[PDB]
């Protein structure tokens, strides 16, 4: 939740949907424990790890493109130092506050 906040960098604040340093508005969050928790894990929701660089406030990226973790030339071909950034989620009824 704190990664949706101004002035921080991470796998979400810069690589999912950037938000500016000058928030105007509100932060609202319904309790998703009884709405968005399912047995076996909510692996439908997916997050990446990095992108090319920082985004701009409220930009859309539905593409799941493979980013270059290292500096080898993928040359349009996935492989060494060209890894999948997306990962799944495990949500369980025994999960803690964190």
């Amino acid at each position, epitope marked *: 939740v704190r990664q949706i906040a101004p002035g921080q960098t991470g796998k979400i604040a810069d690589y999912n949907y950037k938000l500016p340093d000058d928030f105007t508005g509100c932060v609202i969050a319904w309790n998703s424990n009884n709405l968005d928790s399912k047995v076996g894990g909510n692996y439908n929701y997916l997050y990446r790890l990095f992108r090319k660089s920082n985004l701009k406030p409220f930009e859309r990226d539905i593409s799941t*493109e493979i980013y270059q973790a290292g500096s080898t030339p993928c040359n349009g071909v996935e492989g060494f130092n060209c890894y999948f950034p997306l990962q799944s989620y495990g949500f369980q009824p025994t999960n803690g506050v964190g």
Partner: nanobody, 116 residues
């Protein structure tokens, strides 16, 4: 009628099967057309997805079980089922825009599937 489904039927445990869905025009497939299943009892889940950027990334839990391909001659869409057990009763609908929540999905009639 602008979208149809073809293939499927009884699944002998350990046998192969064929399934399909169709569309109307090339602009209808633009930009996203993702496979999806449903199931009585078992939660609904999306089968396969083909993103318009050229890279296809199936769900990490469902990327090693289903092969997905597209044929635009009939607008058909090959789907295969392999080794269903008694715990996987699924009913298949061809519903688009599931990565948009329950505000962009299109509901029609579909077909009813029972797996014993």
């Amino acid at each position: 009628v602008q979208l149809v489904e073809s293939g499927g039927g009884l699944v002998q445990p350990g046998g192969s099967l064929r399934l399909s869905c169709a569309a109307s025009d090339s602009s209808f497939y633009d930009y996203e057309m993702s496979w999806v299943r449903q199931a009585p009892g078992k939660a609904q889940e999306w089968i396969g997805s083909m993103y318009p950027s050229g890279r296809t990334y199936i769900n990490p839990s469902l990327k090693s079980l289903v092969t997905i391909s597209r044929d635009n001659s009939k607008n058909t869409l090959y789907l295969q089922l392999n080794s269903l057990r008694a715990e996987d009763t699924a009913m298949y609908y061809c519903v688009s825009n599931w990565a948009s929540g329950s505000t962009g999905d299109y509901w029609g009639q579909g077909t009813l599937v029972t797996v014993s």
